[PDB]
Amino acid sequence: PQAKYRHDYRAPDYQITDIDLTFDLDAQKTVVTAVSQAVRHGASDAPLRLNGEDLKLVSVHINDEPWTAWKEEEGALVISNLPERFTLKIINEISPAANTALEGLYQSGDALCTQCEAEGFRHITYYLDRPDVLARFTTKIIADKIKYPFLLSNGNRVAQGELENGRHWVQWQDPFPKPCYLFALVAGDFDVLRDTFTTRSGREVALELYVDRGNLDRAPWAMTSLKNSMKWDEERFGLEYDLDIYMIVAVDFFNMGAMENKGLNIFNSKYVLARTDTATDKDYLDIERVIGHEYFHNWTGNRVTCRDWFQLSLKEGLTVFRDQEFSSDLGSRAVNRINNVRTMRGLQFAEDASPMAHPIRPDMVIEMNNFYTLTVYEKGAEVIRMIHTLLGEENFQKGMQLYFERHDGSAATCDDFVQAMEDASNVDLSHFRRWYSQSGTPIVTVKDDYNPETEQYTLTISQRTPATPDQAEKQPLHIPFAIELYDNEGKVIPLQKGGHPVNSVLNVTQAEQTFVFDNVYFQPVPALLCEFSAPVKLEYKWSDQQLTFLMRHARNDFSRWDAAQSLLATYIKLNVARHQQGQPLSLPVHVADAFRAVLLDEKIDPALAAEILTLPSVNEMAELFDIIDPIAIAEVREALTRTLATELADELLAIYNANYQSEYRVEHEDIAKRTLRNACLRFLAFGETHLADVLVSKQFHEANNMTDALAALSAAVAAQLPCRDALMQEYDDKWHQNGLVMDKWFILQATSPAANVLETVRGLLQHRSFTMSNPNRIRSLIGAFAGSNPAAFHAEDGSGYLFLVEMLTDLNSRNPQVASRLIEPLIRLKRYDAKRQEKMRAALEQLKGLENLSGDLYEKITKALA
Template sequence: MTNQPQIKYRQDYRPPSHLISDIHLDFNLNEKKTRVTATSQIQRQTSEDTPLILNGENLILISVSVNDQIWPHYSQKDDHLIIEQLPKAFSLTIVNEIHPDKNTALEGLYLSGQTLCTQCESKGFRHITFFLDRPDVLARFTTRILADKKRYPYLLSNGNKIRQGELKDGRHWVEWADPFPKPSYLFALVAGDFDVLRDQFTTQSGRSVELALFVDKGHLDRADWAMSALKKAMKWDENRFGLEYDLDIYMIVAVDFFNMGAMENKGLNVFNSKYVLAKTETATDKDYLHIEAVIAHEYFHNWTGNRVTCRDWFQLSLKEGLTVFRDQEFSSDSGCRAVRRIENVRLMRSAQFAEDASPMAHPIRPDKVMEMNNFYTLTVYEKGAEVIRMLHTLLGESVFQAGMKRYISRHDGCAVTCDDFVQAMEDASGLDLTLFRRWYSQSGTPELIIRDHYDAQKQQYHLQVSQITPPTADQEKKYPLHIPLDIELYTKKGEVIPLQNQGQPIDSVLNVIKAEQTFIFDSVSSEPVPSLLREFSAPVKLDYPYTDQQLICLMQNARNDFSRWDASQRLLNSYIKKNIAEFHENEPLTLPLHLIEVFRHVLLNDNLSPALIAEILTIPSENEIAELSCFIDPDAIHFVRQKWLRFFSASLSETLWDQYQKHQTPIYRVTHTDTAKRALKNICLQYLAFGRTDIADQRVKTQYQTSSNMTDTFAALTAAVAAQLPCRDFLLSDFESRWHSDPLVMDKWFFLQATRPEKEVVDKVRALLTHPSFSLMNPNRVRALLGAFASSNPVVFHAKDGAGYTLFLEILTTLNTQNPQVAARLIEPLIRFKRYDSVRQKWMKQVLEKLKALNNLSKDLNEKILKALED
């Protein structure tokens, strides 16, 4: 029978009836049957004799004892253990059994290959033992692990190792103690056999911290980059935020089966191996940068998430939005700030804006949830980070850091709310952030409509700014927000015009706080070209009627590199939107030749970073284009984008080839200079692949065959697949034969197979489900093949014959019981059916209705399907 969803409301929060100060966990480990003994020190917080209600799922209860006496006053009901007639303070011992090898949902304790590991966020600990599994119950954990020494030579958990020993029967034990109180979602246990990379880090106060990185046997040569990233992040956090690591050891374990990217468990981070393992032959430049960012993100959680944690799961963005902001700043300080910012904004515009327009729209701090796993979203993470960035923009670096220090010192060791964070910033700055708080409670993507007027006689420039947030699935009525609007004015020759009013300088960040406002600038001697929303100073859509000339001026003269890129995107998007309308009217597409010279100028501009040039040259993805209008036509989008690729290729072929040759890197190094060169070289190759077929085929094949690194190899493969070159099948076959035994590398191959822009891809994807390197049990494989097909190949996935939808009905039916979290992520494109034509809508609704009718529909899928099918 379908699990009926129960809506939980933020306003219904109540403090826990009991608190747990300490818990001692004893694990007798075995992959088929593990016995867990949990002894907790508990204090009732209420005056009346309130029963203790513990969470527990898929557990076999053996015994319950209170103060070392068998306790008969308990019952089990609906995944809860209810214990009654308890004293005010007591020791509770619970013994239960679990079966890790049967745990395909990968929550709690499960088997990843030959390794036993845990994932407890958000509600995984209740799959290990009965507990008050909520983030506002913080306890000091001591963990004793007993297991077969030969099979599991490494037994790891949170905190510091305090003792260990061996038994005569070939088993051994290790005991760990974490001195810092933490919620159960931060608990971790790992048991297995690994290669280990060890290092040391000396903190700013002179403490020596042991660093250990555990990887599968034979992969030690892929661990160096992750270790260097960790040390770099530890140093950066001390320098930028004044935050020092607090335990004697910091451990990272890489596992193959993991629903997420990584987990910040105190002192023992469990990582998806994708975000740890890298070497020249197997990892691209982007892989290296992603590893660095994710390593940093989980380390930064030590303070923003662990030492200060969430009161309840509605406050998830308290830790995630803030920590994403911190890892973005780390990546920006470490590399090219403009390019990192562009990457963040691309994700917002292509994916988070789509989430805002979907049935699952929600604020960064939701007011109600059915299944918490469904709220690990781009809204909570990425938009949450943008809200933190707006605070940083409004306060400035020094005041923001003062607010951070106040926040940490005030709430260290506590479970708090988003309001507590904003209050710390308000107290540090003296600013009234009452209006700003709406960002936490209002969903949707605001739109800034800006119009201007220049008064030549008065030499005054007027900006009329209005803001509107369209209704979302969860909220009909919207209110004005506090929007920081960063601007700059230029003359038509590209000279900067100082901002002033009544003879006084004006800050470049305008505070938009009303539904309609007008800003007046004096001493403007000629009609200006405005650079608006610089650095994407707020997560909003901008409506301003730029002319081609204005955008070209900004592309050539803006002092802010992000603004140069943004102008190029707006210029391309204006014609792409026009082309889509022309496609629908069966008219020839407008492909203006004057744009070619603009982009040729960018290609030849030696004053710009090659990485920035590559970003400016990149045509918006099909998903980005889809967000330019409410109605999505995948066929039109794909056709128009392909036309632009061929138009650029034909018009700029000689310049592209010259730049391709100029930016070769004979020796592979992961330096910002070299990664920038490869980025530009390979975007040139992408365009050249759409040129004359025989020449393009030979150029792409040559790069593939002479490549000494995965960045160039994968770029050649990507170009061959995207342009459907004759060499593509040969190259893909060769790649498979070389890397069939390496799962992470094969994920790249699965991605390329799933994103081929060919109708036959549905049959290819179906056939690949039985490929020796594929496993529906492994989230990485599922994301690489099926996730890529649904999200990165929209023209085929959304084909009107419904073949893609039919395939996904079969996949989601299987994953519904096997791994509901992964299934709920895969279903996202289907629940957005209302943005498509009637034929596609009918197909997608049929799939959702059939899934809804499943007798065992998971809570994860149920919530999304119900919201999608609501009128």
């Protein structure tokens, strides 16, 4: 399995300008005929090298002449002695029914569908499977009419006929040149929700949402979100849809969440199907996000695509930035910013400290599907947001406009995008480009001084990025560091120096620098790195009272929540050391009081109150420690929950009851009150046992929506309440026929604090609703245990590791892309104590000796064992 290197990029020897595909479709045996119009660019003696995986070649013709100057090798068809321009015809067979890996053409229940990104099209036919080759596709599909009445591909429906023996065919044509990763085909029998969107310039777009028969009742919300996404992209970015049809197909069997195939998105049905009794507020907001995200790729990804896969972040970071802007504009900006920062600090930082650490533009890749990461996505989007911060909205939109103007119709690079932002704005981004090529999280250390005699405040800011496995050399970055200074009244002190205003976004571009502010009439309380202005670790010696002052006075809701996190961080760390010495929780009175004040603040946005009253996850808590103690973290989280439930019992029950809502609305103000109410419930579940059991049981049974019912069930599990087993059994009996709803239940089982959690998880491998054939079920049961129950996964007897090895031994052959998502908890071994590393190392060595080890797992295992 060979590494590929970004510095090896070379323009292709041949282009394909047009491809005409014919699928004679059958689950056991599909015959693909592919007629491509090719043009030599390279040396006249260069062979055409086509990618192909698991393809049965039937014939090779060049201008209709059967070709003798070719050979097959590992993953390729090499064709020699070609004219400068020619028609390539390939005929080959593939077998959808045998495709367990779910890449290329496969079976989803009774449907046939495709997944081609990153390199899945070479599983369908021999092709230039590289994103800088853009061709105009036309696609004829021939299939059994009763089994596949709907035959879908990208673009517009240009031809159709019937044939003998109950077959029919449809031809599609997509006028936009595309890399083959954007190719899609779907065959099956669906219910179809149809609607329309009229674009701002009056183009009328048929919207079509394909769902399994019987699911039309779960489709309107995805349709609404689609129109919302199209409207928003017009208002915010000035971007209109460019075709006449927009199709989305919800499939149950899918390795990822969704895919932006031009004019024909394929979606995991998890990101389509919602009804108020099956779906939570979080599902609704996720559907909106993911619908919007694939929609936004129509421009940032499709109209302008990626020159090579090392440029992935060019589309993913930028499209994540967009879906965050969408969610934030439509919903609560503060809650969105808070949650995206949780993800950054709790999940992405961990990856940047891992053996899989990489720059947002990687330099080296063995298996490209291994790089659809928190780094390329979430940190990518933080980098885009820093550009936005440096340029401001107006110049940022100008840089978007110049980007499309220069690159519409072509495959571009990260550096092109930076270049467009830089030229449109006249902001210098040459230093800034270092964020693309350097991995690891910078640590920004702040020291301050107030001088009463000169009324000057001085910040001495430094930065370093520790070395990572992949990079021995590190250099300072261009770090936009936003500050605000508060006087004793909570008023913002104007920033200025020598009689002139100073931008509150400081340019931290050196290893060490000093910033001096004048006319600081009172010793300030600083808010630092406001709105998480650079993806960095902040090191500043806060006092508790600086932090409670910020919770009370900071202008932006994000800084209030962030202050609360810095306050908690101190006491999480205190109490994990205590836990390790056998000592019970200790928390000063004035900390509990900051949280009492939040509960009883009548002016606070409930959306903000709810986030402050949501404790860091065990994953955000882990990132406060060099060496992770997963059991101490888990138990301290619980003890902190119990302590606050006891100290704030009366205030919690009052705020819980005050936020009752008899109507269920998917509306942001209602979501916010319900999130606060359920945050109050979480603590109440951990107070006095009889009261808790009554409250939780009652909520589960009286809920008129899945949000309140799951919140209850999930508190029953978390606090191991007496009602737990009956409620869990009831949900099983009601919902077992419905995989997406049962995924919620598998997650709760997988993340239970019960002593016997692993025994229960293993038994659930035999559950009526579970199957190894379904990525959703695998992730919900096995992935949630290994990744979201660190206390049990890291049981000291090493039983967690052995369990995962067993599962990955299966999945390595069945579905390597899911195997490689699931191995991730094991590759974090260097973060754990020496006894744990030794057991995890041993598990990894077991996996490395597997016969037919997939490249997907090979890459991670070898970096981890190094």
